[PDB]
Amino acid sequence: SALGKLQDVVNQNAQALNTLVKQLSSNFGAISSVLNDILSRLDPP
């Protein structure tokens, strides 16, 4: 009133989940990152 070996696990796991969430906003070479804006202004082919 020390615990860094326990805070390291919490931090590493949050840092991985954040990267997974944030990769949902890359185009990977498409026109939009959001699927609804490809579906709305393009036709199936």
């Binding site: 709305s40 202004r41 393009l42 036709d43």
Partner: protein, 49 residues
């Protein structure tokens, strides 16, 4: 109609754009859209033309 090296640009704004009077009109030789589909232009909204 101006020539190819001094083409004229008109900005369109503040109006409903009905491509229905244009897409169901069989009077043009080429109608090629890129990034959009000429049948879904009445569902979108645009910032400028």
């Amino acid at each position: 109609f101006a020539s190819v090296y001094a083409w004229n640009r008109k900005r369109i704004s503040n109006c409903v754009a009905d491509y229905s009077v244009l897409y169901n009109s069989a009077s043009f030789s080429t109608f090629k859209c890129y990034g959009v589909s000429p049948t879904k232009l009445n569902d979108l909204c645009f910032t400028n033309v």
